[PDB]
Amino acid sequence: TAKDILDQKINDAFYVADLGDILKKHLRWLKALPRVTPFYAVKCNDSKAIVKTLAATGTGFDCASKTEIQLVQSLGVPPERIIYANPCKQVSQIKYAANNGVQMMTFDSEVELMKVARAHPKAKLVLRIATDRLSVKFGATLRTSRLLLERAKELNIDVVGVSFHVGSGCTDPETFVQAISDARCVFDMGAEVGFSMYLLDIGGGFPGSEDKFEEITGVINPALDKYFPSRIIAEPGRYYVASAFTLAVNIIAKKIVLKEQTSEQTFMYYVNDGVYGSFNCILYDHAHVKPLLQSSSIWGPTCDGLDRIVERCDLPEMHVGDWMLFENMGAYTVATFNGFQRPTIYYVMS
Amino acid sequence: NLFYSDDRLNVTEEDKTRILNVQSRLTDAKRINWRTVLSGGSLYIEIPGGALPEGSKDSFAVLLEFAEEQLRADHVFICFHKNREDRAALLRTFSFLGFEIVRPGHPLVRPDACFMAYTFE
Ligand SMILES: Cc1ncc(COP(=O)(O)O)c(C=O)c1O
């Protein structure tokens, strides 16, 4: 399919994105999650095209910054589809969201609460809880939850629901079913502290490649029909955009290393896209990217110690000037001048 | 030398540029201090030995009120050795906050240490 348009440009790192894969995956979504309303975590990929198709279908948008609600408000999306769900929210951001009609704002601590109280006190707060590996802890614990639920009243702020987020690398569905359980308990103490709760947000983390979805979604559906039967939204990201993109990188340096004891030829290729540019994954989530063509190790443009895309892979010789490919490079591979790059994306909508 | 103190913070100072020792007397938490340094708008927090004491981010989040509001910082950078052993989990967690990894050589930053930069809005 679009796995040729690459070649049509082969004659400086660039993307091609199957903009249909975005749609079929959304179709796959509401066929697997008919009850849940997906809200795109735009921080995953803030490319306008990716958003504009998604918005035009029927997905909400979990935004996390000023520029992000801009992108999504400019596309004429009604502020009733926007949820501001940044873990740590700056004050000016609370205000901007207030001045612009966005109402759903998350929280998981009293620190976040005070901030909301003096910037946007009339917001619809959704208490993010902590589903059971990361440094700091995110989400409230079942106890502190209650204290937040009371404090919200003792401040007179409307809490309208709860949220969680198991995130990536969840290696067991019994984690999802548990949060929804804890999400019930929290709904209670809220209804008990006197809140007309109605919004359950289950966050995001569902995979976007085939390396599974329905497996995670199928332990969910009986859990929602259980604890929450008769509103449910989500905050997916990696799901939608992963398998859509394919990165094309050009070899820009070649070196041969021998290591003789007393007999081992090995190649090193340097490309024009690195771990500080696109491949944030490998030092973030410790990815394992396999390279495609048309023994070695692939390194990045910055001559840095850990600008190492792949450390060891069996690969025929080159020379310089060749392109290599990486599939499923759509999630968290795009961002800018801090911090600069900007590549070019080729959207292919069949 | 009594820089700043409110209900949640206690930042004493160390000496030019201006180094800050911000400390969170949070509403119920243990003691969390962050040896930071403010140099020309931007502030540079150094990240402790790890693992992190149970208080942050509630502490660190306060460390972003101030300095956005008192130090009027446009940039807040964090740094840790590289090394360490949880560089991943570290890189990952702070990224959940509006942070991002900084490509070496930037004008606002040694090679033994890994940086990350959060910009305000
Ligand atoms: C609150 C929230 N929702 C959604 C996401 C992104 O979800 P996903 O893991 O599918 O990219 C993030 C970060 O993981 C997040 O912090």
Author numbering:
A (entry chain A): 19 to 29, 38 to 158, 165 to 243, 247 to 265, 270 to 301, 310 to 341, 352 to 392, 396 to 410
B (entry chain B): 93 to 106, 111 to 205, 208 to 219
Give me lines lifted from the publication on this model:
ODC requires the co-factor pyridoxal 5′-phosphate (PLP) and is catalytically active only in the homodimer form12. Polyamine homeostasis is achieved by Antizymes, a class of small proteins that inhibit ODC activity and polyamine uptake into cells. In addition, AZ1 has been shown to inhibit ODC activity and promote ODC degradation by the 26S proteasome.
Here, we describe the crystal structure of human ODC-cAZ1 complex in the presence of co-factor PLP. The ODC monomer consists of two domains: the N-terminal TIM-like β/α-barrel domain (residues 44–283), which binds the co-factor, and the C-terminal domain (residues 19–43, 284–410). cAZ1, comprising a sheet of eight mixed parallel and anti-parallel strands and two helices, is embedded in a concave surface formed between the two domains of ODC. The N- and C-domains of ODC interact with AZ1 to generate two interfaces, I and II, with buried solvent-accessible surfaces of ~2000 Å2 and ~1400 Å2 respectively. Therefore, the binding of AZ1 to ODC occludes the binding of a second molecule of ODC to form the active homodimer. As the binding of AZ1 occupies the position of the C-domain of ODC, it disrupts the substrate binding site, while leaving the co-factor binding site largely undisturbed. Our crystal structure provides additional support for this hypothesis by revealing the conformational changes of ODC upon AZ1 binding: the N-terminal domain of ODC moves by about 10° with respect to its C-terminal domain. This movement is accompanied by the transition of an ordered C-terminal helix (residues 411–421) to a disordered state, as the residues involved in stabilizing the helix have shifted by about 2.6 Å.
